[PDB]
Design a binder for this molecule. Sequence first.
Ligand SMILES: CN1CCN([C@@H]2CCCN(c3cnc(C(N)=O)c(Nc4ccc(C5CCNCC5)cc4)n3)C2)C1=O
Ligand SMILES: [Cl-]
Ligand SMILES: [Pd+2]
Length: 270
Amino acid sequence: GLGYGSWEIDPKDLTFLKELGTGQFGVVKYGKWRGQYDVAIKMIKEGSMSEDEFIEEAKVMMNLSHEKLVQLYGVCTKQRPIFIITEYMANGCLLNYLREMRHRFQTQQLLEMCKDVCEAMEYLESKQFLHRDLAARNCLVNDQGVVKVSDFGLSRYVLDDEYTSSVGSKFPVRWSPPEVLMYSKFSSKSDIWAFGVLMWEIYSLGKMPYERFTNSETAEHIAQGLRLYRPHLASEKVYTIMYSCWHEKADERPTFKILLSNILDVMDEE
Ligand SMILES: CN1CCN([C@@H]2CCCN(c3cnc(C(N)=O)c(Nc4ccc(C5CCNCC5)cc4)n3)C2)C1=O
Ligand SMILES: [Cl-]
Ligand SMILES: [Pd+2]
């Protein structure tokens, strides 16, 4: 079934309806399951994913459930390429949504986007599950404007060395704390650092962080103490939240439970 029953999905029950573009593992399509339920169909480019490892991990991911996580419905592994079937998010990735200036967002909407992501991350934190590549490009927006976190943990199965190497052209340098870039020290606190950068992306309406610097320059400067400036749309209180994520000491960074409380406190002032 689709979130029920077997999680090997019969591709005969899928109908392809629209190209959605491409992501980390290649082509993504919009389709229907048994003619009625909307799904996203990720077809996994051969050679791009450590597939046996992912399929084992997918059993763990099937047991995660939260309103603000994109739901994994199942897999189609009896053909080439394999497919991954997930919840359909009709407004696409958050980065491109933020960049569409027609939306004319209120800051109350931007803060709600932060809350949505923070709830998803607090849940993963409570399950001791790291995201490992949190960023606006890995969040999706549904037809009601709700933001959900996608592809949690999947960087562990990416085979492209340019994304795996911390000096590769595709590694998320601009979302990484100094202890990741210098020592490969991943923890819940490296997700915290990335979440702060994500809040900055939201309040900057999708600007690239540290745009005036190359990846190498960014890595050097943030380790010395350079920090992203306050976006014009972020109040001082909102900036303090995102800024707290970038402490040079990992153990001085908040948890996602603390961040959520801080975000709700600002929201409750409305
Ligand atoms: C605007 N781009 C271009 C490419 N890309 C993404 C990047 C990440 C992987 N890929 C996914 C994954 N999963 C889903 C899901 N679970 O829905 C999904 N959905 C989706 C994607 C794009 C749209 C566009 C948005 C603007 N109006 C026309 C339609 C709509 C739904 N795309 C494609 C992306 O967002
Ligand atoms: Cl700005
Ligand atoms: Pd062949």
